PDB file of C-alpha atoms and ligand atoms in Angstrom:
ATOM      1  CA  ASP O   1       8.171 -20.702   1.616  1.00 48.62           C
ATOM      2  CA  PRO O   2       8.931 -19.759  -2.002  1.00 50.77           C
ATOM      3  CA  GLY O   3       7.887 -16.165  -1.347  1.00 48.85           C
ATOM      4  CA  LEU O   4      10.281 -15.917   1.595  1.00 50.39           C
ATOM      5  CA  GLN O   5      13.304 -17.150  -0.379  1.00 51.43           C
ATOM      6  CA  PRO O   6      14.428 -14.826  -3.209  1.00 52.74           C
ATOM      7  CA  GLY O   7      16.056 -15.994  -6.425  1.00 51.37           C
ATOM      8  CA  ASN O   8      19.609 -16.230  -7.728  1.00 53.52           C
ATOM      9  CA  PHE O   9      20.980 -13.024  -9.267  1.00 54.71           C
ATOM     10  CA  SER O  10      24.288 -11.530 -10.388  1.00 54.30           C
ATOM     11  CA  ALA O  11      26.241  -8.443  -9.335  1.00 55.70           C
ATOM     12  CA  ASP O  12      25.677  -6.546 -12.597  1.00 57.13           C
ATOM     13  CA  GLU O  13      22.990  -3.964 -13.322  1.00 57.11           C
ATOM     14  CA  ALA O  14      20.945  -6.501 -15.310  1.00 56.33           C
ATOM     15  CA  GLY O  15      21.054  -8.809 -12.304  1.00 56.68           C
ATOM     16  CA  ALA O  16      19.799  -5.893 -10.221  1.00 58.26           C
ATOM     17  CA  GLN O  17      16.996  -5.367 -12.742  1.00 60.24           C
ATOM     18  CA  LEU O  18      15.934  -9.010 -12.442  1.00 56.77           C
ATOM     19  CA  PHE O  19      16.177  -8.591  -8.657  1.00 56.75           C
ATOM     20  CA  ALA O  20      13.888  -5.548  -8.663  1.00 57.54           C
ATOM     21  CA  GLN O  21      11.517  -7.266 -11.116  1.00 58.36           C
ATOM     22  CA  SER O  22      11.083 -10.261  -8.810  1.00 56.67           C
ATOM     23  CA  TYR O  23      10.737  -8.025  -5.747  1.00 58.24           C
ATOM     24  CA  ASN O  24       7.391  -6.644  -6.957  1.00 59.59           C
ATOM     25  CA  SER O  25       6.218 -10.147  -7.870  1.00 58.71           C
ATOM     26  CA  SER O  26       6.754 -11.387  -4.314  1.00 61.26           C
ATOM     27  CA  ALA O  27       5.460  -8.126  -2.832  1.00 61.42           C
ATOM     28  CA  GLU O  28       2.142  -8.650  -4.613  1.00 62.15           C
ATOM     29  CA  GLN O  29       1.165 -11.748  -2.645  1.00 58.54           C
ATOM     30  CA  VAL O  30       2.733 -10.747   0.668  1.00 58.36           C
ATOM     31  CA  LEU O  31       1.365  -7.190   0.749  1.00 59.58           C
ATOM     32  CA  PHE O  32      -1.999  -8.478  -0.477  1.00 57.13           C
ATOM     33  CA  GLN O  33      -2.259 -10.871   2.463  1.00 57.67           C
ATOM     34  CA  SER O  34      -1.034  -8.170   4.867  1.00 56.96           C
ATOM     35  CA  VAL O  35      -3.649  -5.675   3.667  1.00 61.26           C
ATOM     36  CA  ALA O  36      -6.293  -8.411   3.789  1.00 61.39           C
ATOM     37  CA  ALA O  37      -5.432  -9.141   7.427  1.00 61.10           C
ATOM     38  CA  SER O  38      -5.512  -5.427   8.267  1.00 65.24           C
ATOM     39  CA  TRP O  39      -8.882  -5.133   6.507  1.00 66.49           C
ATOM     40  CA  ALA O  40     -10.233  -8.083   8.494  1.00 67.72           C
ATOM     41  CA  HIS O  41      -9.029  -6.451  11.709  1.00 65.54           C
ATOM     42  CA  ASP O  42     -10.589  -3.116  10.672  1.00 63.75           C
ATOM     43  CA  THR O  43     -13.656  -3.711   8.479  1.00 62.53           C
ATOM     44  CA  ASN O  44     -14.874  -6.567  10.706  1.00 62.30           C
ATOM     45  CA  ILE O  45     -14.919  -7.521  14.386  1.00 62.94           C
ATOM     46  CA  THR O  46     -11.643  -6.919  16.204  1.00 65.18           C
ATOM     47  CA  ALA O  47     -11.772 -10.367  17.816  1.00 66.19           C
ATOM     48  CA  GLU O  48     -10.598 -13.562  16.083  1.00 69.56           C
ATOM     49  CA  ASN O  49      -8.556 -11.442  13.642  1.00 70.56           C
ATOM     50  CA  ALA O  50      -5.869  -9.759  15.776  1.00 69.37           C
ATOM     51  CA  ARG O  51      -3.754 -12.923  15.694  1.00 67.85           C
ATOM     52  CA  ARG O  52      -4.321 -13.130  11.930  1.00 69.32           C
ATOM     53  CA  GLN O  53      -2.997  -9.577  11.623  1.00 69.85           C
ATOM     54  CA  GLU O  54      -0.044 -10.404  13.879  1.00 73.78           C
ATOM     55  CA  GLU O  55       0.976 -13.481  11.882  1.00 73.31           C
ATOM     56  CA  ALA O  56       0.520 -11.584   8.604  1.00 72.01           C
ATOM     57  CA  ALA O  57       2.803  -8.837   9.913  1.00 72.43           C
ATOM     58  CA  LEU O  58       5.318 -11.458  11.052  1.00 74.01           C
ATOM     59  CA  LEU O  59       5.436 -13.138   7.645  1.00 75.13           C
ATOM     60  CA  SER O  60       5.697  -9.792   5.835  1.00 79.80           C
ATOM     61  CA  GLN O  61       8.573  -8.868   8.146  1.00 80.40           C
ATOM     62  CA  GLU O  62      10.315 -12.174   7.394  1.00 79.95           C
ATOM     63  CA  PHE O  63       9.795 -11.532   3.668  1.00 82.19           C
ATOM     64  CA  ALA O  64      11.413  -8.107   3.933  1.00 86.55           C
ATOM     65  CA  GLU O  65      14.189  -9.450   6.161  1.00 85.60           C
ATOM     66  CA  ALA O  66      15.299 -12.174   3.756  1.00 87.92           C
ATOM     67  CA  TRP O  67      14.889 -10.140   0.571  1.00 85.28           C
ATOM     68  CA  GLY O  68      16.696  -7.098   1.974  1.00 87.37           C
ATOM     69  CA  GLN O  69      19.466  -9.261   3.421  1.00 87.66           C
ATOM     70  CA  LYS O  70      20.082 -10.735  -0.022  1.00 89.66           C
ATOM     71  CA  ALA O  71      19.930  -7.235  -1.531  1.00 89.89           C
ATOM     72  CA  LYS O  72      22.625  -6.004   0.842  1.00 88.36           C
ATOM     73  CA  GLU O  73      24.833  -9.090   0.506  1.00 90.62           C
ATOM     74  CA  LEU O  74      24.777  -8.857  -3.280  1.00 88.63           C
ATOM     75  CA  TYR O  75      24.797  -5.123  -4.093  1.00 87.53           C
ATOM     76  CA  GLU O  76      26.478  -3.387  -1.150  1.00 83.39           C
ATOM     77  CA  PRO O  77      29.519  -2.257  -3.219  1.00 78.28           C
ATOM     78  CA  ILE O  78      27.441  -1.353  -6.300  1.00 81.16           C
ATOM     79  CA  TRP O  79      24.425   0.136  -4.482  1.00 82.70           C
ATOM     80  CA  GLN O  80      25.412   3.682  -5.457  1.00 84.80           C
ATOM     81  CA  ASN O  81      26.326   3.544  -9.155  1.00 82.26           C
ATOM     82  CA  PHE O  82      23.349   2.311 -11.176  1.00 83.50           C
ATOM     83  CA  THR O  83      22.826   5.021 -13.866  1.00 83.85           C
ATOM     84  CA  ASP O  84      19.037   4.794 -13.430  1.00 83.70           C
ATOM     85  CA  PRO O  85      16.970   6.490 -10.692  1.00 89.63           C
ATOM     86  CA  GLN O  86      14.234   3.832 -10.644  1.00 91.68           C
ATOM     87  CA  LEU O  87      16.245   0.730  -9.765  1.00 89.20           C
ATOM     88  CA  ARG O  88      18.633   2.841  -7.680  1.00 89.92           C
ATOM     89  CA  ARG O  89      15.715   3.917  -5.489  1.00 87.25           C
ATOM     90  CA  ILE O  90      14.378   0.348  -5.451  1.00 84.00           C
ATOM     91  CA  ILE O  91      17.713  -0.992  -4.199  1.00 83.84           C
ATOM     92  CA  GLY O  92      17.969   1.861  -1.704  1.00 83.69           C
ATOM     93  CA  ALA O  93      14.563   0.991  -0.273  1.00 86.45           C
ATOM     94  CA  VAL O  94      15.214  -2.763  -0.141  1.00 88.07           C
ATOM     95  CA  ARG O  95      18.722  -2.365   1.315  1.00 88.88           C
ATOM     96  CA  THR O  96      17.515  -0.651   4.501  1.00 87.39           C
ATOM     97  CA  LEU O  97      16.811  -3.527   6.895  1.00 89.57           C
ATOM     98  CA  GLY O  98      15.755  -1.339   9.822  1.00 89.27           C
ATOM     99  CA  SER O  99      16.051  -3.164  13.135  1.00 88.50           C
ATOM    100  CA  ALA O 100      16.672  -6.530  11.450  1.00 88.21           C
ATOM    101  CA  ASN O 101      20.423  -5.845  11.632  1.00 86.49           C
ATOM    102  CA  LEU O 102      20.354  -6.463  15.384  1.00 87.16           C
ATOM    103  CA  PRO O 103      21.208  -9.938  16.729  1.00 90.11           C
ATOM    104  CA  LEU O 104      18.466 -12.231  18.035  1.00 90.48           C
ATOM    105  CA  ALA O 105      18.588 -11.107  21.673  1.00 92.16           C
ATOM    106  CA  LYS O 106      18.993  -7.434  20.749  1.00 93.00           C
ATOM    107  CA  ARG O 107      16.147  -7.574  18.221  1.00 92.32           C
ATOM    108  CA  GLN O 108      13.859  -9.293  20.731  1.00 91.71           C
ATOM    109  CA  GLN O 109      14.731  -6.650  23.320  1.00 94.04           C
ATOM    110  CA  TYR O 110      13.993  -3.898  20.787  1.00 90.53           C
ATOM    111  CA  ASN O 111      10.592  -5.309  19.823  1.00 95.08           C
ATOM    112  CA  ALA O 112       9.649  -5.899  23.461  1.00 96.13           C
ATOM    113  CA  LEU O 113      10.749  -2.327  24.207  1.00 96.89           C
ATOM    114  CA  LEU O 114       8.400  -1.005  21.528  1.00 93.32           C
ATOM    115  CA  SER O 115       5.549  -3.137  22.878  1.00 93.10           C
ATOM    116  CA  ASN O 116       6.153  -2.024  26.474  1.00 93.05           C
ATOM    117  CA  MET O 117       6.315   1.611  25.340  1.00 93.97           C
ATOM    118  CA  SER O 118       3.008   1.451  23.480  1.00 94.49           C
ATOM    119  CA  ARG O 119       1.349  -0.405  26.363  1.00 93.30           C
TER     120      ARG O 119
HETATM  121  C1  LIG X   1       7.998  -4.617  30.272  1.00 98.81           C
HETATM  122  O1  LIG X   1       8.380  -5.809  29.630  1.00 98.81           O
HETATM  123  C2  LIG X   1       8.677  -6.846  30.537  1.00 98.81           C
HETATM  124  C3  LIG X   1       9.411  -7.935  29.790  1.00 98.81           C
HETATM  125  O2  LIG X   1      10.739  -7.515  29.585  1.00 98.81           O
HETATM  126  C4  LIG X   1      11.030  -7.426  28.178  1.00 98.81           C
HETATM  127  O3  LIG X   1      12.303  -7.937  27.909  1.00 98.81           O
HETATM  128  C5  LIG X   1      13.369  -7.306  28.618  1.00 98.81           C
HETATM  129  C6  LIG X   1      14.654  -8.003  28.215  1.00 98.81           C
HETATM  130  C7  LIG X   1      13.391  -5.789  28.376  1.00 98.81           C
HETATM  131  O4  LIG X   1      13.712  -5.452  27.052  1.00 98.81           O
HETATM  132  C8  LIG X   1      12.002  -5.223  28.662  1.00 98.81           C
HETATM  133  O5  LIG X   1      11.881  -3.851  28.394  1.00 98.81           O
HETATM  134  C9  LIG X   1      11.023  -5.959  27.762  1.00 98.81           C
HETATM  135  O6  LIG X   1       9.716  -5.452  27.813  1.00 98.81           O
HETATM  136  C10 LIG X   1       7.355  -7.277  31.171  1.00 98.81           C
HETATM  137  O7  LIG X   1       7.513  -8.456  31.949  1.00 98.81           O
HETATM  138  C11 LIG X   1       7.801  -8.279  33.352  1.00 98.81           C
HETATM  139  O8  LIG X   1       9.165  -8.507  33.641  1.00 98.81           O
HETATM  140  C12 LIG X   1       9.536  -8.630  35.006  1.00 98.81           C
HETATM  141  C13 LIG X   1      11.038  -8.792  35.056  1.00 98.81           C
HETATM  142  O9  LIG X   1      11.408  -9.994  34.424  1.00 98.81           O
HETATM  143  C14 LIG X   1       8.742  -9.796  35.613  1.00 98.81           C
HETATM  144  O10 LIG X   1       9.086 -10.208  36.933  1.00 98.81           O
HETATM  145  C15 LIG X   1       9.095  -9.174  37.942  1.00 98.81           C
HETATM  146  O11 LIG X   1      10.379  -9.119  38.536  1.00 98.81           O
HETATM  147  C16 LIG X   1      10.586  -8.606  39.845  1.00 98.81           C
HETATM  148  C17 LIG X   1      11.060  -9.722  40.779  1.00 98.81           C
HETATM  149  O12 LIG X   1      11.855 -10.614  40.029  1.00 98.81           O
HETATM  150  C18 LIG X   1       9.401  -7.814  40.399  1.00 98.81           C
HETATM  151  O13 LIG X   1       9.352  -6.520  39.826  1.00 98.81           O
HETATM  152  C19 LIG X   1       8.027  -8.456  40.117  1.00 98.81           C
HETATM  153  O14 LIG X   1       7.479  -9.095  41.244  1.00 98.81           O
HETATM  154  C20 LIG X   1       8.024  -9.503  38.977  1.00 98.81           C
HETATM  155  O15 LIG X   1       8.240 -10.813  39.435  1.00 98.81           O
HETATM  156  C21 LIG X   1       7.269  -9.419  35.545  1.00 98.81           C
HETATM  157  O16 LIG X   1       6.442 -10.396  36.114  1.00 98.81           O
HETATM  158  C22 LIG X   1       6.897  -9.288  34.075  1.00 98.81           C
HETATM  159  N1  LIG X   1       5.506  -8.947  33.919  1.00 98.81           N
HETATM  160  C23 LIG X   1       4.636  -9.604  33.125  1.00 98.81           C
HETATM  161  C24 LIG X   1       5.205 -10.775  32.361  1.00 98.81           C
HETATM  162  O17 LIG X   1       3.460  -9.290  33.017  1.00 98.81           O
HETATM  163  C25 LIG X   1       6.779  -6.094  31.956  1.00 98.81           C
HETATM  164  O18 LIG X   1       5.480  -6.344  32.427  1.00 98.81           O
HETATM  165  C26 LIG X   1       6.705  -4.834  31.081  1.00 98.81           C
HETATM  166  N2  LIG X   1       6.406  -3.670  31.880  1.00 98.81           N
HETATM  167  C27 LIG X   1       7.183  -3.117  32.836  1.00 98.81           C
HETATM  168  C28 LIG X   1       6.592  -1.896  33.496  1.00 98.81           C
HETATM  169  O19 LIG X   1       8.279  -3.540  33.173  1.00 98.81           O
HETATM  170  C1  NAG X   2      22.000 -18.973  -6.387  1.00101.71           C
HETATM  171  O1  NAG X   2      23.057 -18.898  -5.454  1.00101.71           O
HETATM  172  C2  NAG X   2      22.835 -19.506  -4.199  1.00101.71           C
HETATM  173  C3  NAG X   2      24.011 -19.182  -3.303  1.00101.71           C
HETATM  174  O2  NAG X   2      23.900 -19.895  -2.095  1.00101.71           O
HETATM  175  C4  NAG X   2      22.630 -21.004  -4.407  1.00101.71           C
HETATM  176  O3  NAG X   2      22.333 -21.663  -3.198  1.00101.71           O
HETATM  177  C5  NAG X   2      21.442 -21.197  -5.335  1.00101.71           C
HETATM  178  O4  NAG X   2      21.225 -22.550  -5.631  1.00101.71           O
HETATM  179  C6  NAG X   2      21.659 -20.453  -6.651  1.00101.71           C
HETATM  180  N1  NAG X   2      20.475 -20.601  -7.454  1.00101.71           N
HETATM  181  C7  NAG X   2      20.407 -21.243  -8.634  1.00101.71           C
HETATM  182  C8  NAG X   2      19.039 -21.253  -9.271  1.00101.71           C
HETATM  183  O5  NAG X   2      21.365 -21.784  -9.164  1.00101.71           O
END
């Protein structure tokens, strides 16, 4: 999936600018499909759309996982010094991977814990 895989960037601030300029481009399609699935679950019948919403959430999560992982791997040492609040905040938001940092078994346990809690 081209949306799932980010591009090739450098470690400089201009590379970070290209990074943050492609992030919105991917976010357009992925967030659009996510909001469309949520709308279908909400504005229409709840049946035959819950699995659509679930798969949309899964693909959005994979998008964020890959893009944030690349963000961290490239700009962990230079995340602080950027001399511009906009891209600094963009990199700060993308860097935070949430629960994605956990290994496979730990992440599965965490998600199943959340599901059991809500249920
Ligand atoms: C909570 O979730 C479990 C599944 O477990 C999930 O993964 C774990 C690694 C933890 O992170 C959990 O928090 C996480 O939710 C639901 O599945 C239930 O699991 C049990 C244990 O495996 C199943 O077997 C039971 O085991 C013993 C005997 O071996 C007896 O208690 C029962 O007779 C039963 O066999 C159980 O069938 C299974 N239930 C399902 C699949 O419906 C669990 O329902 C859910 N809620 C609670 C209250 O635990
Ligand atoms: C960017 O770097 C990655 C590092 O694995 C490499 O695989 C990829 O081909 C590079 N992209 C381009 C367009 O050269």
